[PDB]
Amino acid sequence: ATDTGGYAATAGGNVTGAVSKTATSMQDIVNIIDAARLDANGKKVKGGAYPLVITYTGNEDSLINAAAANICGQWSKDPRGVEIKEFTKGITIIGANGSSANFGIWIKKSSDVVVQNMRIGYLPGGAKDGDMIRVDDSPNVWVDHNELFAANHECDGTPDNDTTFESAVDIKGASNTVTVSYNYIHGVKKVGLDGSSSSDTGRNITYHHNYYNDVNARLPLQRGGLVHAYNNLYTNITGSGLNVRQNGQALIENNWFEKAINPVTSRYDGKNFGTWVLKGNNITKPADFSTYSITWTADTKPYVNADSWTSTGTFPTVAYNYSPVSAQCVKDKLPGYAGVGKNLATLTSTAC
């Protein structure tokens, strides 16, 4: 009921008294959430009046296909997103099979929100924080079985030469417990941070059963706190993978890395390096780097790469319950469980 396979423990809107609503457009979602704040007398209730299970049936493929054809025209447009602000009664946004969105979901100062089966891609507004999914000051959030994509490319003349597209799953502030699972993330330059700055440290986040393909960096860019990454399939990482900074701790287990540059590193600050515990991945020693095409580069400032492929620290006892399959099974089976239209199916050893 509340088990997500990670630090977040929430059933979202699937609780007692939940009200099911169907949203056929972005605006419907905005309107549904707004109406969910009113009590029987028409007065607003802090945190929302009742739980919601919104089934999104809209399809914005036309906007997505047009954007795919003109990648560089996106960054300067207005960003589009549904804001879930200060809603704590519990909410679940689930896309219907065949649904799609060219707008993001921005969660802020909320809790107990689940977003599932949403296909989001090529969002406008990279220069104005056009994130696909943003989790800000929001604990108990579960981002599961979604497809988040764009083009892993940077156009010229974009602000900071970094705004062609914004991130897939940015997590910041007091989002103390979050689970990111079964997501198919592809064609994304900046996957997502875990802390917006050097001072925004903390949180306990779990990334599991995600399928990353053709992504440049931030898987995540971790700032302190704890990160548990298990059963993820990392392929074609063009910049760096897990960047553990500000003394953060990471447990990296039973993942499959392939064709990746700097898969596990601590760079860009020049100090306060994070640590990692490595176990059960397809890579077990440096000899495997050649086998799976793992490349390492240096950085202009002091850095630490996992080129020795050894644990550099410790990790506290993982609270929740979980059962990872083998790194091989991930590589063989994960692409069929990750993403939309998989009916929220999960990979078990039985299926291996």
Annotated binding site for Ca(2+): 129, 131, 166, 170
Binding-site residues from annotation:
129, 131, 166, 170
Size of the site for Ca ion (CB under 5 A): 5
The contacts of residue 76 (CB under 8 Å, 6+ apart) are 127
- Among residues 129 and 162, whose Cβ is nearest to Ca ion? 129
CB of 135 to Ca ion, least distance (A): 11
- Among residues 129 and 332, whose Cβ is nearest to Ca ion? 129
Alpha carbon distance 244, 232 (integer Å): 17
Q: Give residues 126-165 in contact with Ca ion (rule: CB under 5 A).
A: 129, 131
Hey, what are 224's tokens? 């302190």
Find out whether 220 and 196 touch, Cβ atoms under 8 Å: no
Alpha carbon distance 212, 220 (integer Å): 12
CB of 241 to Ca ion, least distance (A): 19
Positive or negative, the CA dihedral 173, 128, 187, 67 is positive
One-letter amino acid identity for 310?
T
Find out whether 101 and 132 touch, Cβ atoms under 8 Å: no
Q: Is 258 near Ca ion (CB under 5 A)?
A: no
Site string for Ca ion, 101-130 (x = CB under 5 A): ----------------------------x-
Q: Is 194 near Ca ion (CB under 5 A)?
A: no
Alpha carbon distance 219, 39 (integer Å): 41
Using CB under 5 A, which of the segments 10-18, 153-161, 168-176, 231-239 binds Ca ion? 168-176
- Catalytic one among 119, 218, 223, 245? 218
Instruction: Give the residue from 59, 60, 55, 58 showing the smallest Cα distance to 22.
Output: 55
Q: State which H helix or E strand residue 55 sits in.
A: strand 52-56
Instruction: Give the residue from 246, 238, 320, 231 showing the smallest Cα distance to 280.
Output: 231
Active site residue 218: yes
Find out whether 342 and 182 touch, Cβ atoms under 8 Å: yes
CB of 291 to Ca ion, least distance (A): 35
Q: Is 170 near Ca ion (CB under 5 A)?
A: yes
Using CB under 5 A, which of the segments 72-80, 167-175, 266-274, 335-343 binds Ca ion? 167-175
One-letter amino acid identity for 307?
D
CB of 129 to Ca ion, least distance (A): 5
CB of 108 to Ca ion, least distance (A): 12
- Among residues 104 and 248, whose Cβ is nearest to Ca ion? 104
Find out whether 93 and 105 touch, Cβ atoms under 8 Å: yes
3-state secondary structure of 88: coil
- Among residues 131 and 258, whose Cβ is nearest to Ca ion? 131
- Among residues 58 and 195, whose Cβ is nearest to Ca ion? 195
Residue numbers annotated as active site: 218
- What residue ranges bind Ca ion (CB under 5 A)? 129, 131, 166-167, 170
